[PDB]
Amino acid sequence: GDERFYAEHLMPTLQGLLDPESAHRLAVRFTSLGLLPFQDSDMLEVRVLGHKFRNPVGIAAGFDKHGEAVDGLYKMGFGFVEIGSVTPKPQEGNPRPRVFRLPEDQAVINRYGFNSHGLSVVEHRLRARQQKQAKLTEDGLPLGVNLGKNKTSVDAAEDYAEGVRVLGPLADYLVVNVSSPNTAGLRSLQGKAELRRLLTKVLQERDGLRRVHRPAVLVKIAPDLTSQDKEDIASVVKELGIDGLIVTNTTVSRPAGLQGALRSETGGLSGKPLRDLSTQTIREMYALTQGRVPIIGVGGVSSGQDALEKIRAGASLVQLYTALTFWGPPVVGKVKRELEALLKEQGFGGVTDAIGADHRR
Ligand SMILES: Cc1cc2nc3c(=O)[nH]c(=O)nc-3n(C[C@H](O)[C@H](O)[C@H](O)COP(=O)(O)O)c2cc1C
Ligand SMILES: CCOc1cccc(-c2ccc(NC(=O)/C(C#N)=C(/C)O)cc2)c1
Ligand SMILES: O=C(O)c1cc(=O)[nH]c(=O)[nH]1
Structure with a gap:
């Protein structure tokens, strides 16, 4: 599992042979079969959300939408796996093509x-x-399940209630995905009154599930919220004792400077151009939320530095x-190794010490 071989040869070859959706599909297949290319330090262990996480680096929702590659993902070195989004009824999603690569920007647009x-x-x-x-x-290898809603619902x-009932008993945490840019009306569920009721x-x-089958509940939010939107979310989260937040989904913004030919495709933008908007x-x-x-x-x-910036900004994980779509599987060990070195370099005893550190200087 060599970073350079994957970064310069395997991935560009794969990207040259297949369209992005096909590559994704093959990636899921390959991962699920456990054919794949770092020993986690105690320093990387985090305790949050009623669980031990052996390292704080998880696979985000959308890669394994249907829960097919969970074990293969743990084998890749992820400290936790999140599957989904899962909708109540099966549905096909948008017409193809609906995923686009922006290699000059180390970005993806999906719809x-x-x-x-x-x-x-x-x-x-x-x-x-x-x-x-x-x-x-x-x-120390928890499972998250991300819940969505059907187009015609x-x-x-x-x-979301149906999702809680059906997959809640199988999950360490649930995610109420209220932030996809690709479902009409969904992001309006982030508004105060709508959100509180939801x-x-x-x-x-x-709360009606049996104790051993009772997951933490998190809300996943957009990077495109107004100041008022964010205030309202924070207020509702504290009013209801929501267990956590996932920050952020993809952006509908198109930051100045994008170079990819496909930059004006409709959909959510991910990867490097999203990085600092998400951190902020x-x-x-x-x-x-007062760090609480x-x-x-x-x-x-994409790096230890990227991870630590989010951690010092207030992320526990x-x-x-x-x-992963640019660098392939070696990126996981790379992020972890770099993060570990940076923690030592900056005088942190471990991940836990670094959480929210920027707010304390
Ligand atoms: C192809 C694609 C599909 C995604 N599908 C979902 C989804 O089903 N549910 C969700 O909550 N987030 C989804 N996301 C958003 C990611 O979980 C993540 O929030 C976002 O891509 C930012 O992280 P990244 O820059 O590392 O990709 C998807 C992202 C991409 C790239
Ligand atoms: C020789 C196998 O190398 C691997 C092993 C496991 C996974 C991957 C891999 C992971 C994700 C991708 N995904 C994409 O390239 C992609 C795009 N575009 C998306 C949307 O997942 C591709 C390959 C590549
Ligand atoms: O399924 C999608 O289109 C999707 C969902 C989501 O939450 N985020 C995203 O970027 N895409």
């Missing part, structure tokens, strides 16, 4: 539109390995996806 095998299919897939997962979780809150329902459903959103959300609400930081993480 998948919640292509999902649906709750029932994912439920059975997770049930087939439920005890294996119980042991992985106990070993009338009642968004009932879609999350009240979600939390009631979650983490920083604001951490301040508005765990944050999973996501967006543009980080995730990546887009970097």
Whole structure:
């Protein structure tokens, strides 16, 4: 598992032979079969959300939408895996092409539109390995399940409620994905009144599950929120005792300077141009919640430095996806090795010490 070989040869060859969606599909297949190319220091261990995480580097939602490659992802070195988004009924998502690479920007634009095998299919897939997962979780390798809603659903809150009922018993944490830019009306669920009503329902459903089957609940937010939007979210999160936030989803913005020919495709932008917009959103959300609400930081993480910036901004854990599509599997060990070195260099005893450190200087 050599970084240079993957970065300069394997990935560019793969990217030259297949369209992005096909490459994604082959990636999932290959990962699930456990054919793949770092020993985690105690310094990387984090305890949050009612769990031990052996390292703070997770695979973000969208790579394994249907829960097919969970074990292969742990083998890749991820400290935690998040699957989804999963919708109640199966649905196909948007017409193809719907994923686009911007290699000059180390970015991706996607408009998948919640292509999902649906709750029932994912439920059975997770049930087939439920005890294996119980042991992985106990070993410090938790599982997150990200919930979406169907395109034609009338009642968004009932879609999330159904997700809580069906996959909640199989998850260490649930994500109420209220931030996809690719489902009409979805991001409006981030508004105060809508959000309070939605999350009240979600939390009631979650609280009705048996103790050993009772997941933490997080809300995943956009990087495109107004100051007022962020204030309102922070307020609702604290009012309801939401367990954490995932910050951030993809951006509908197109930062000045994008070079990719495909920069004006519709969809969510991910990877390097998102990085600091995401970090700044983490920083604001951490301040508005007084450091009391765990944050999973996501967006543009490709290095130890990227990870530590999000951690010092207030993230307890980080995730990546887009970097894997450029650098391949060696990126996971790279991020971890670099993060470990930076923690030592900056005088932190471990990840935990660094969480929110920028707010204390
Ligand atoms: C192809 C693609 C599909 C995604 N699908 C989902 C999704 O289903 N649900 C979700 O919450 N986030 C989804 N995301 C967003 C990622 O989870 C993450 O928030 C975002 O891509 C920023 O991280 P990154 O720059 O490391 O990719 C997707 C991202 C991409 C690249
Ligand atoms: C020889 C195998 O190397 C691997 C092993 C496991 C995964 C990967 C790999 C992971 C993700 C991707 N994904 C993409 O390239 C992509 C795009 N565009 C998306 C949307 O996932 C491709 C390859 C490559
Ligand atoms: O399915 C998608 O289109 C999608 C969902 C999401 O939450 N974020 C994203 O970038 N794409």
